Design a protein. Structure first.
Lengths: 66, 90, 91
């Protein structure tokens, strides 16, 4: 919880995917530091090019895009 | 052949879905499984049954999810002919 | 209206594409755009000029990519004979 210790946890560059049935996305950098504790990560959906925003707590649990 | 194609808003889906966004995408496939639509692109589900009253009930089943109304970016149906796979990649 | 849909194996594309997966997506789209196929709703590249000969010229152009063969999961073309949009969920 240092704003480094948080940031060095978002795997910027990883190409993950929302579930077994979700679309793949690419992990951006920080968007906001929510007081819940976790962080809003900037994200761009790979196959549509849409940019979006995602909780890091959710992010770290999705699998790698296959 | 019929297709359903859709996109969720990820910020909206996480806020509104009870469980994750993972859960949203997995939920939808299961509803669309009730009416013959298999996942073929993650954002494109196909059924090969051109009955419209199937689509209709499938769409109505999808509108039953309370979070869809607040979290979908876009959702489309279309009627697909001349489905064609390419494998001249050697 | 014709549509092209495609998926790439992500590990394989990272190996063989000289830059990366997000450029392999963009670079494939560059080709398809040379044949009027353009993505407007996410993930589907559509043309609306239903000339089968043009679609084939694009698949032909596509194999001209060094890394495509070893880094493509799926690619499919098909016809969208009719479509309709859904905003009855926003209700």
């Amino acid at each position: 919880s240092s704003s480094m210790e948080l940031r060095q946890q978002i795997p910027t560059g990883c190409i993950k995917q929302f579930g077994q049935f979700g679309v793949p996305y690419v992990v951006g950098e920080v968007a906001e530091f929510l007081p819940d504790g976790d962080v809003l990560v900037n994200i761009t959906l790979l196959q549509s090019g849409e940019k979006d925003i995602y909780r890091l707590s959710y992010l770290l649990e999705d699998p790698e895009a296959e | 052949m019929y297709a359903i194609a859709f996109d969720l808003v990820v910020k909206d889906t996480q806020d509104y879905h009870p469980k994750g966004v993972q859960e949203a995408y997995t939920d939808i496939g299961a509803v669309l499984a009730k009416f013959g639509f298999v996942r073929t692109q993650g954002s494109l589900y196909t059924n090969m049954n051109e009955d419209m009253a199937n689509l209709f009930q499938a769409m109505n089943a999808l509108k039953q999810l309370a979070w869809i109304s607040q979290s979908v970016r876009d959702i489309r149906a279309f009627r697909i002919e001349q489905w064609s796979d390419f494998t001249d990649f050697i």
